[PDB]
Design a protein around this nucleic acid. Structure first.
Ligand SMILES: [Zn+2]
Length: 134
DNA sequence: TAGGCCTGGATC
DNA sequence: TAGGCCTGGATC
């Protein structure tokens, strides 16, 4: 749905990858054995991305803010386990794969490349670049 | 299909 | 992690 926009590039570089595995925490979306790393395509809302696509609903605010918080909490945990199992994690938010700021289809491959292969601490890819996971 | 709203939903 | 609605475009 958005997983594709990114998935399409993966095979674009051949990169050996499996999909949505429920045997790995946070059930990654893309799993790559070619580097012992997993990727995530998190929607900006459910996971509270401090990006333009995040808007606290005006209804049942407290019910959504608390539900969301538990999500972030679950990601933190998820990532942490993955890292424990010798996995490198990368998060690519939607705000940088769909929307009025979405990385030009170039910048991605160009950024995914320097990552996936050329090693590097876990990190996240957003509309304004890629930074250490944190 | 482009995004912009509005809510929960289905599962496990 | 949505799907249902509604707008406004590009493709044909
Ligand atoms: Zn975002």
């Amino acid at each position: 749905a958005i997983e594709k926009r990114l998935a399409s590039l993966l095979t674009g570089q051949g990169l050996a990858f499996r999909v949505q595995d429920a045997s790995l925490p946070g059930r990654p979306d893309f799993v790559v054995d070619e580097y012992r790393c997993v990727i995530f395509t998190h929607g900006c809302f459910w996971h509270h991305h401090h990006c333009y696509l995040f808007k606290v609903p005006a209804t049942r605010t407290e019910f959504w803010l608390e539900k969301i918080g538990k999500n972030v909490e679950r990601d933190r945990r998820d990532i942490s386990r993955l890292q424990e199992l010798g996995w490198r994690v990368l998060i690519v938010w939607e705000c940088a794969l769909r929307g009025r700021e979405k990385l030009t289809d170039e910048a991605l491959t160009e950024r995914l490349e320097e990552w996936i292969c050329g090693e590097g601490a876990s990190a996240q890819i957003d509309t304004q670049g890629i930074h250490l996971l944190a």
